[PDB]
Amino acid sequence: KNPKSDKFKVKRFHHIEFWCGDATNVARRFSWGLGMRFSAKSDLSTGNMVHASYLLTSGDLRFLFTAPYSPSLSAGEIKPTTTASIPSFDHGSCRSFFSSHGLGVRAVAIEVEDAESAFSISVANGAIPSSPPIVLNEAVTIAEVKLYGDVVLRYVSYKAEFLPGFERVEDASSFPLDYGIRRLDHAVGNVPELGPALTYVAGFTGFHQFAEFESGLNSAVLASNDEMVLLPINEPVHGTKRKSQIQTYLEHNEGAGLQHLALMSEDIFRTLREMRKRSSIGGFDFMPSPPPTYYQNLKKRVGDVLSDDQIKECEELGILVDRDDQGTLLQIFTKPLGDRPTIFIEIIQRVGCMMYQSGGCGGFGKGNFSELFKSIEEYEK
Amino acid sequence: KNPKSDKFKVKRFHHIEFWCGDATNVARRFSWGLGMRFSAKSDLSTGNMVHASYLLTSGDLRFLFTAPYSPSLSAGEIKPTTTASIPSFDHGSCRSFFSSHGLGVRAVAIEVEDAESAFSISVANGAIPSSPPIVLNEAVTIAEVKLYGDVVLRYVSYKAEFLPGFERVEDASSFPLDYGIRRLDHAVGNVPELGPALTYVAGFTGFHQFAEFESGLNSAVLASNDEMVLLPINEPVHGTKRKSQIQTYLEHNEGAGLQHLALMSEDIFRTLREMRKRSSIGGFDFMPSPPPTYYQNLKKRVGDVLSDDQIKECEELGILVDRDDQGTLLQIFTKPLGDRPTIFIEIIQRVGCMMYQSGGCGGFGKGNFSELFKSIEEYEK
Numbered sequence: 001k002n003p004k005s006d007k008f009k010v011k012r013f014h015h016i017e018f019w020c021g022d023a024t025n026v027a028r029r030f031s032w033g034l035g036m037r038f039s040a041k042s043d044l045s046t047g048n049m050v051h052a053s054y055l056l057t058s059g060d061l062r063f064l065f066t067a068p069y070s071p072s073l074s075a076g077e078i079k080p081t082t083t084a085s086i087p088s089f090d091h092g093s094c095r096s097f098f099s100s101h102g103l104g105v106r107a108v109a110i111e112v113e114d115a116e117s118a119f120s121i122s123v124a125n126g127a128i129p130s131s132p133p134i135v136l137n138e139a140v141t142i143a144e145v146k147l148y149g150d151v152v153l154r155y156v157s158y159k160a161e162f163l164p165g166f167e168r169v170e171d172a173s174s175f176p177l178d179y180g181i182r183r184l185d186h187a188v189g190n191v192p193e194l195g196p197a198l199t200y201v202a203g204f205t206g207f208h209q210f211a212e213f214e215s216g217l218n219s220a221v222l223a224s225n226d227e228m229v230l231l232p233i234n235e236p237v238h239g240t241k242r243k244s245q246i247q248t249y250l251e252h253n254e255g256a257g258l259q260h261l262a263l264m265s266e267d268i269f270r271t272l273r274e275m276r277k278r279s280s281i282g283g284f285d286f287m288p289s290p291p292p293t294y295y296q297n298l299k300k301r302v303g304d305v306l307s308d309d310q311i312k313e314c315e316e317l318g319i320l321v322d323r324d325d326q327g328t329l330l331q332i333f334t335k336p337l338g339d340r341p342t343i344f345i346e347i348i349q350r351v352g353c354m355m356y357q358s359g360g361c362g363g364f365g366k367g368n369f370s371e372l373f374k375s376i377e378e379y380e381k
Numbered sequence: 382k383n384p385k386s387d388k389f390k391v392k393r394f395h396h397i398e399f400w401c402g403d404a405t406n407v408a409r410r411f412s413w414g415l416g417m418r419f420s421a422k423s424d425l426s427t428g429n430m431v432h433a434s435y436l437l438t439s440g441d442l443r444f445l446f447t448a449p450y451s452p453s454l455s456a457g458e459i460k461p462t463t464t465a466s467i468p469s470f471d472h473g474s475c476r477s478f479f480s481s482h483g484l485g486v487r488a489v490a491i492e493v494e495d496a497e498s499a500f501s502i503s504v505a506n507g508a509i510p511s512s513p514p515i516v517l518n519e520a521v522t523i524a525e526v527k528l529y530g531d532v533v534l535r536y537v538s539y540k541a542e543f544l545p546g547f548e549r550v551e552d553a554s555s556f557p558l559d560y561g562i563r564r565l566d567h568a569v570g571n572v573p574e575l576g577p578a579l580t581y582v583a584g585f586t587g588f589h590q591f592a593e594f595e596s597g598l599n600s601a602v603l604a605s606n607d608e609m610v611l612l613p614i615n616e617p618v619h620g621t622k623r624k625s626q627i628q629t630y631l632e633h634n635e636g637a638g639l640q641h642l643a644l645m646s647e648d649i650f651r652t653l654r655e656m657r658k659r660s661s662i663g664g665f666d667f668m669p670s671p672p673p674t675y676y677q678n679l680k681k682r683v684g685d686v687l688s689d690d691q692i693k694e695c696e697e698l699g700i701l702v703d704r705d706d707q708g709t710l711l712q713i714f715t716k717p718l719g720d721r722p723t724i725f726i727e728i729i730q731r732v733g734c735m736m737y738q739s740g741g742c743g744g745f746g747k748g749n750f751s752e753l754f755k756s757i758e759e760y761e762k
């Protein structure tokens with residue numbers, strides 16, 4: 001049941017912005033770890049005296065990494081005279097964000113038809129404003145509303161190349177890495193209470209609850225009209241034996257924030273081979289592979305879709321598999337991206353639900369929880 | 382003339398400690414960019430609730446990367462109950478350091494015979510104390526005095542594996558990278574006034590002025606008794622046409638600090654090949670190569686030591702060459718290591734002055750300034 005109640009016209013995920021202390025080093029580690037190319041820059045070399053920002057791209061995926069410069073470089077400017085290419089940026093907000101959360105996502109940015117209209121209708125429907133709409137070089141407008149914790153939902157709209165003031169990077173510096181990652185699939189938040197978060201976000205966007213099918217969570221998924229912008233949210237469930245990983249998140253993160261980003265790959269086997277090659281030489285580490293019993297019980301549950309050739313290929317890479325009633329899903333999780341046990345990345349491939357592929361095809365692999373658990377028990381036996 | 386006036390027994394450079402906002406990402410970028418192996422860790426997985434610290438090693442070189450966790454994790458501890466493996470660490474000092482300077486060196490640590498004695502004699506001779514001597518697991522003692530800006534000189538002494546509380550890292554995670562880098566050669570500071578800095582540091586260490594032979598600088602080199610611990614210091618020279626890079630440093634860094642670390646390589650040609658391979662895939666970038674005229678004029682100045690086979694091999698890699706009267710030196714500079722135009726790295730090889738090799742053999746390549754300049758002019762002609 002998809003009511004299609006978007007209060008404004010939403011298109012697709014546009015970019016994810018990371019607030020760091022040093023954008024150069026984080027950007028280079030991510031570039032190598034995920035196979036993302038250096039696409040554009042705004043920094044001292046482009047006249048930006050306020051913040052350094054570097055964009056990585058892989059297919060449609062856009063990762064933005066930003067860190068502040070000393071405020072002394074831009075003490076003489078005023079908001080109308082600013083050299084910052086992202087007008088919402090603020091030194092104190094950024095330093096406070098990163099000292100409070102460490103490395104994490106500041107903005108989930110979606111492209112819309114009219115950013116100003118999306119901001120106005122949003123706040124008229126209960127959104128807490130973060131930065132009012134601003135028009136950039138009469139060409140793009142950007143506005144921000146609060147999403148949860150210190151994460152903002154950023155609206156971007158174009159009249160007619162990332163953002164004004166940014167520059168394309170030199171051919172030399174830009175090496176054409178690509179491990180198969182193609183676009184952002186969903187972005188997930190951890191909150192203390194799911195109800196008020198769901199009520200709040202649904203209420204200013206009009207996103208509807210996405211169709212679902214006893215460890216830690218309780219979650220829900222808001223989705224846009226075409227279900228191409230998916231925004232899951234988790235809350236912890238207390239009093240269990242194994243303490244909630246969601247509560248672990250909230251303690252180390254100092255409150256709500258973005259938990260994981262799910263990236264879609266065209267060939268999840270090539271992605272996971274190439275990412276695993278680089279794990280111990282600067283890239284990313286993966287959550288430990290599930291017991292061989294798990295793969296023994298996969299025949300009986302996904303026999304019709306996965307040949308054991310493609311199946312044993314998942315065993316090599318430790319991939320997890322789940323299926324809904326319309327589709328099937330391949331997924332694996334990284335270890336946390338930084339010092340704290342907070343944000344991590346999911347690589348996914350969806351097969352099914354062709355018409356183009358419809359969003360959420362296969363679900364989000366929640367069954368994999370119980371399945372994994374069962375496997376563990378069976379492999380101990 | 383080497384007076385050998387060390388006020389206490391100094392051995393060698395022990396490690397360099399980096400204060401960052403996220404130690405994981407910086408460590409991984411450096412590991413891949415310089416070919417340093419992951420050696421030890423102190424973090425949540427080792428019981429450290431205060432700070433995450435990761436050590437990289439290449440030969441004798443030890444790079445330590447540290448970032449704070451949320452203070453909430455260790456709000457119940459007191460200094461006697463701390464879980465921090467580096468007792469000098471302080472959340473507010475670290476956050477203030479990194480918001481003020483960005484990524485940079487916090488500690489230059491030298492090994493000595495008795496850290497307590499080195500601290501006491503130091504402060505009795507004018508050193509500003511930073512952290513008093515502390516004994517760790519009845520085995521190692523660490524003490525800190527101020528060096529310049531917010532950089533400290535750290536004394537380390539062992540009774541008899543990095544530091545107590547640290548753990549050796551898993552064989553898997555630890556990939557045996559090595560591009561030839563073998564030890565730290567010198568660590569250089571930029572200050573507003575060279576005289577008071579020289580007076581101050583010489584006065585509490587007893588380090589003597591190292592033997593020397595019109596662009597930006599004015600510098601001097603303090604050295605220990607055997608001249609194996611070298612501590613150059615620069616100040617800016619104003620009023621020139623091209624603004625001092627030292628003054629550029631001080632403005633963007635928000636005061637004095639460490640400008641560059643010089644790392645010695647066993648084969649500088651292998652190091653520079655392997656580092657250059659990785660420049661655009663997560664590693665480091667290099668200062669643009671000097672004009673071919675520069676290499677034309679090299680025959681006439683280093684003909685006796687460098688064969689043109691080894692010489693044209695420098696042309697490939699852009700290496701710079703200088704010579705003193707006792708030795709010869711090969712050197713090249715990276716672009717800055719982070720967002721700000723502050724800290725950078727020098728790779729060097731010294732050939733000459735055998736007996737073991739004596740410190741400073743070849744000097745520090747200051748002649749290369751004028752030489753480079755001349756070359757530029759000649760290549761324009």
Ligand SMILES: COc1ccc(-n2c(=O)c3c(C)c(C(=O)C4=C(O)CCCC4=O)ccc3n2C)cc1
Pocket residue numbers: 186188217219220232233234260262287288289290320333346364365366368369372
């Ligand atoms: C080896 O030890 C392990 C291995 C794996 C796990 N695990 C996850 O963390 C995990 C996640 C985070 C999702 C997920 O994607 C997410 C939901 O949970 C909430 C709604 C939508 C959504 O996107 C799906 C399955 C998962 N599994 C099996 C724990 C311990």
Ligand SMILES: COc1ccc(-n2c(=O)c3c(C)c(C(=O)C4=C(O)CCCC4=O)ccc3n2C)cc1
Pocket residue numbers: 567569598600601613614615641643668669670671701714727745746747749750753
């Ligand atoms: C292509 O544009 C360029 C290329 C290169 C340079 N340059 C440096 O930065 C540079 C440095 C930093 C040292 C050095 O190591 C240092 C001293 O200067 C102070 C005392 C001891 C010490 O260790 C030696 C030679 C250098 N040269 C030619 C500027 C602009």
Ligand SMILES: [Co+2]
Pocket residue numbers: 186188260262346364
């Ligand atoms: Co997911």
Ligand SMILES: [Co+2]
Pocket residue numbers: 567569641643727745
């Ligand atoms: Co040098």
